[PDB]
Amino acid sequence: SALITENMHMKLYMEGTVNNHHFKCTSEGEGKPYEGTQTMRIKVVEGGPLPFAFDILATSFSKTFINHTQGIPDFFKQSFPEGFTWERVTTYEDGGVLTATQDTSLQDGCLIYNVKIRGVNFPSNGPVMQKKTLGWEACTEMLYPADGGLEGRSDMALKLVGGGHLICNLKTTYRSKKPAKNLKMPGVYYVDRRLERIKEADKETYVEQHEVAVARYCDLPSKL
């Protein structure tokens, strides 16, 4: 009856290109969906070492593991057993652009992610291609219902060697594989998110990554 249990496991396969460099990854992990925490152990299995900072792939390895507090209707957990998809455009302020499309199915009690990456115009002398990145700041995503699906908007800050940040923006469309007759859509809400790199080995051809993610309505006083 309940398909998303207290502890869930993941398998993931990813394939793409950045600028003109092909590659493939696999990853494997586990998390607690209702606590909104999760870990992925990732391997670059083709085309590594990558000639770009791994950070730009980070947001592409898990929407099921968000703590939907306050009885906010959970669009992603509801979509099972059919599952869902996301597609995203991340636009860097220094030219780089990264689209990704994703499929999330459930199979024998294991979440299965199939990702596809397409990056273009990352400046060759930029911090991404010259590997001067130190992971991401935390962020807030705004989700809102749109066309029987959900949309996400967010700005993210990539730390740089030397103190600075390079900023990017994310437009995400989330689509449920489940008939809209069976889904109870949420209002506008907000996910607070902290995505962190735990460990890495061999020039980022092995990376461990963690996320904590908690959904909430705006908690400030209203006057309307």
Numbering used by the authors: 2 to 62, 66 to 228
Quote the study that presented this structure, word for word.
Fluorescent proteins have facilitated major breakthroughs in modern molecular cell biology. They are widely used for studying biological events, such as cellular trafficking and endocytosis, and have contributed to the development of innovations such as multiphoton microscopy, genetically-encoded sensors, and super-resolution microscopy. mKate, a derivative of eqFP578 from Entacmaea quadricolor, is a bright, monomeric, far-red fluorescent protein with excitation and emission peaks at 588 nm and 635 nm, respectively. Structural characterization of mKate under different conditions revealed the pH-dependent trans-cis isomerization of its chromophore, a discovery that further aided the development of mKate variants with enhanced optical properties. Using a structure-informed approach, we introduced a minimal set of two mutations in the chromophore environment of mKate. The first mutation, S158A, has been shown to destabilize the trans conformation of the chromophore, whereas the second mutation, S143C, was intended to impact the cis conformation.
Mutation S143C may de-stabilize the cis-conformation by removing a hydrogen bond between the side chain of S143 and the chromophore. The chromophore in the crystal structure of mKateS143C adopts only the trans-conformation at neutral pH, consistent with the proposed role of S143 in stabilizing the cis-conformation and the spectral properties of the protein. The brightness of the single-mutant mKateS143C is more than 100-fold less than that of mKateS158A, consistent with a destabilization of the cis-chromophore, which was predicted for this mutation based on the mKate crystal structure.
